[PDB]
Amino acid sequence: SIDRYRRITKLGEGTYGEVYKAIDTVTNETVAIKRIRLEHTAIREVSLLKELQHRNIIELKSVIHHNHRLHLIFEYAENDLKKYMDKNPDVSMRVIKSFLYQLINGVNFCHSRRCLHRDLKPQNLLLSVETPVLKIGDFGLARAFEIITLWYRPPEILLGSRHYSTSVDIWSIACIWAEMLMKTPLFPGDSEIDQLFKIFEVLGLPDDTTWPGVTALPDWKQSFPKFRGKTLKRVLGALLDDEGLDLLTAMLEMDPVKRISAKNALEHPYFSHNDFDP
Numbered sequence: 102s103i104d105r106y107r108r109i110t111k112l113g114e115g116t117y118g119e120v121y122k123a124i125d126t127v128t129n130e131t132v133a134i135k136r137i138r139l140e141h142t143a144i145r146e147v148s149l150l151k152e153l154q155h156r157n158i159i160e161l162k163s164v165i166h167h168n169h170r171l172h173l174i175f176e177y178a179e180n181d182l183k184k185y186m187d188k189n190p191d192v193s194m195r196v197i198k199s200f201l202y203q204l205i206n207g208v209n210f211c212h213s214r215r216c217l218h219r220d221l222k223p224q225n226l227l228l229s230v231e232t233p234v235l236k237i238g239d240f241g242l243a244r245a246f247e248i249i250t251l252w253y254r255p256p257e258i259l260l261g262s263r264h265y266s267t268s269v270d271i272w273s274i275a276c277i278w279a280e281m282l283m284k285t286p287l288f289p290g291d292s293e294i295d296q297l298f299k300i301f302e303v304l305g306l307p308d309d310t311t312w313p314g315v316t317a318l319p320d321w322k323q324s325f326p327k328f329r330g331k332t333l334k335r336v337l338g339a340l341l342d343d344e345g346l347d348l349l350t351a352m353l354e355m356d357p358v359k360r361i362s363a364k365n366a367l368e369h370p371y372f373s374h375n376d377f378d379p
């Protein structure tokens with residue numbers, strides 16, 4: 102029942118429909134309500150997301166399906182990463198590494214329950230009140246139901262693969278991480294092919310050794326330029342220690358099956374030094 106929620110105040114339009122903040126008069130807490138525009142099992146699917154209870158995941162508190170309208174009630178977070186990086190240019194390396202750890206930790210929690218995000222970006226990395234706590238929003242919604250979307254999309258998707266795996270989210274994490282360090286997007290494409298080009302420009306053009314099966318993907322072009330790769334070292338090696346570089350490189354393997362897992366990323370030596378807040 103939506104009648105529980107008062108002072109419902111529109112915040113803007115999201116991916117799925119209108120987004121609001123509200124007061125939950127049963128708990129006194131502020132919540133976010135997301136109107137999910139449909140028309141084209143869904144309630145079951147979305148309801149399973151309620152089990153994703155983790156400090157680095159925006160909690161799905163309630164699914165309300167009434168008068169043939171669908172609202173999701175979520176935990177409220179006052180800030181998000183894009184806004185936060187805009188407002189905080191001098192933010193420390195320690196905050197950046199904490200945000201990264203926290204993102205990977207959330208992601209690993211979800212992947213371990215067979216839940217993929219598929220559309221990670223700084224805009225759904227919400228921040229809640231020394232360091233804010235990073236909480237990922239909208240896990241599982243891309244499934245269950247603007248050029249910026251492209252910037253965090255992995256090459257297997259851009260090349261037209263039908264198989265989304267956990268590796269998709271790992272790619273996106275690496276892109277977000279690079280952006281936090283560089284203050285501009287790593288691969289700021291303006292089309293799916295321009296996007297691939299931006300990726301190939303840094304990482305090199307794949308072949309059937311570096312990425313077995315790549316040339317059979319639907320949108321592969323035998324005419325792609327034979328990019329050698331600027332290399333990540335050259336692009337951002339100045340901003341990152343050697344350990345950080347090795348992690349980032351592992352997350353940006355172009356073949357999704359070679360891309361590091363969230364779990365192995367959390368085990369990487371980069372996070373063994375107590376120089377961040379989990």
Ligand SMILES: Nc1ncnc2c1ncn2[C@@H]1O[C@H](COP(=O)(O)O)[C@@H](O)[C@H]1O
Pocket residue numbers: 112113114115116120121132133159175176177178179181224225227238
């Ligand atoms: N859980 C949340 N808590 C607070 N604000 C949110 C939440 N999710 C999305 N928003 C805000 O709602 C608007 C649309 O969200 P987005 O889906 O990022 O386009 C933006 O103003 C976001 O800042």
